[PDB]
Amino acid sequence: MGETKKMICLVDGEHYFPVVKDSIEILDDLEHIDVVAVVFIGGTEKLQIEDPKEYSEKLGKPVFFGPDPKKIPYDVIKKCVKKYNADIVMDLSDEPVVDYTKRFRIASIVLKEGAVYQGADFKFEPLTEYDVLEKPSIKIIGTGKRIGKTAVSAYAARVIHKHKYNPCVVAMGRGGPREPEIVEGNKIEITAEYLLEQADKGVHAASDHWEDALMSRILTVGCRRCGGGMLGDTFITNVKRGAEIANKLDSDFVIMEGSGAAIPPVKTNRQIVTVGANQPMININNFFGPFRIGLADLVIITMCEEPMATTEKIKKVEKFIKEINPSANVIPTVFRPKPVGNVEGKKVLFATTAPKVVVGKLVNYLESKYGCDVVGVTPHLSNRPLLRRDLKKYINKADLMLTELKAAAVDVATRVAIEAGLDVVYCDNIPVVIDESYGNIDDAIIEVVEMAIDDFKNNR
Ligand SMILES: [Cl-]
Ligand code: NA
């Protein structure tokens, strides 16, 4: 009742019983603490009681045990937290029963159930959660840096828009005003003529909200946060107000996104998680990698090709995701350009900042899939004089310049192409399936949306 915290204590058999009983009795006798249950998590070397009902009677608490003393009983911990609606799991164990890795596995279980996980010198808080959305919703998050989370979220937004779900995006980003701003990405025209104006102001604004709306081409609520935690919380954010704005917009469906590791602290129906095949394995299979993957209804694996990842790296990542989240759908992908408009039969100058080692693959993909002739590649998208010099080589050999759609591309690359009198076709960098034995990415995204709408209708 009141503010008496329901605590579950983790204890081991590498302690003599009186020391364990002493600590449990102290916590049970202390104000504001209710020890609802004890989970014995392993060890037998110091046990002097063989009968577990005796152990429980002498301790004076319900005591839960896994069958194997050599391993952490992760499912017994999860079930105990749910049974007693525990507020805190207090770890009173030590080596050799726990180590760093096992404590992050325990933390991932406890924090997912909305309980604090604490020990002598560490405390982890579960994610802040505001239940504010009055529309069906998904959250799209990532497991690390440089995995193309932005390209995956904007692709998802465009797919959901294309299938007539009338989405909006709430983007909790790295800048913006204190009151969330509405950016009408639905009104943006992907033409050189329209963009010339609006990209310069986007570049110079103290936010990426314009670029978010440019990539998604949907109604965007521009939010901000300062930093992100290890689990994915943030110190301070206006995203709760951004969600309340989304409820009032002409939209039927809400996509919540966050910058970096920061997970929007707004309850959604379903989640998409992006994982990079290029990540250090430890960031996937250790720390809070498994926690994030455990949130997924759909995992998109990115960068599934050399030089970012070997076949062996890609299969280990797929294997790990199936072991921790077997119910999630999983799609492995690579990034490829998708032109916005027709390039079939056209001679193309491909304006791309992609590494030399992958340009060949992208060129072969454009020629084989979209039927263009790539006559040249220029990496000079940010420098006007160098792009001008490049255009001098190609201004008589190319029908158009094919350029990635980013705020930076409009202000520089578009202007110099239109100045040189060369047609401009934009392209999006999109996730493409590499392994037909996994599903269709668009169908996987729409399945999540349908599940979200069903959840929303059934909960009312
Ligand atoms: Cl277990
Ligand atoms: Na107490």
Author numbering: 1 to 460
Reported in the publication:
The enzyme cyclic di-phosphoglycerate synthetase that is involved in the production of the osmolyte cyclic 2,3-diphosphoglycerate has been studied both biochemically and structurally. The reaction involves the transfer of the γ-phosphate group from ATP to the substrate 2,3 -diphosphoglycerate and the subsequent SN2 attack to form a phosphoanhydride. The unique structure of cDPGS is made up of an N-terminal domain which is crucial for the stabilization of the active dimeric structure and the ligand interactions, and a C-terminal domain that contains a P-loop kinase fold as part of its structure. Since the cDPGS reaction is exergonic at cellular concentrations, cDPG accumulation is favored thermodynamically until this reaction reaches equilibrium. cDPG appears to play a role in the thermoprotection of proteins, and increased thermostability has been demonstrated for several model enzymes in its presence.
The cDPGS crystallized readily in many screening conditions and the structure of the apo-cDPGS was solved by the single wavelength anomalous dispersion (SAD) method using data collected from a selenomethionine protein crystal. The space group was determined to be I222 with a single protomer of cDPGS in the asymmetric unit. The structure was refined to 1.7 Å resolution and was found to contain the entire polypeptide chain. This has been refined to R and Rfree values of 17.7 and 21.3%, respectively. The structure of cDPGS can be split into two domains. The smaller N-terminal domain contains a six-stranded β-sheet of mixed type with direction + + + + + − and connectivity -1x,-1x,3x,1x,1 flanked by 4 α-helices (α1–α4). The β-sheets of the two N-terminal domains in the cDPGS dimer form a large intersubunit 12 strand β-sheet on the molecular dyad. The larger C-terminal domain (residues 136–460) contains a twelve-stranded β-sheet (β7 – β18) surrounded by twelve α-helices. The cDPGS structure shows a tight dimer that buries a surface area of 2844.1 Å2, accounting for 13.7% of the total solvent accessible area of the protomer. The interface is stabilized by 36 hydrogen bonds and 24 salt bridges between the interacting subunits as estimated by PISA.
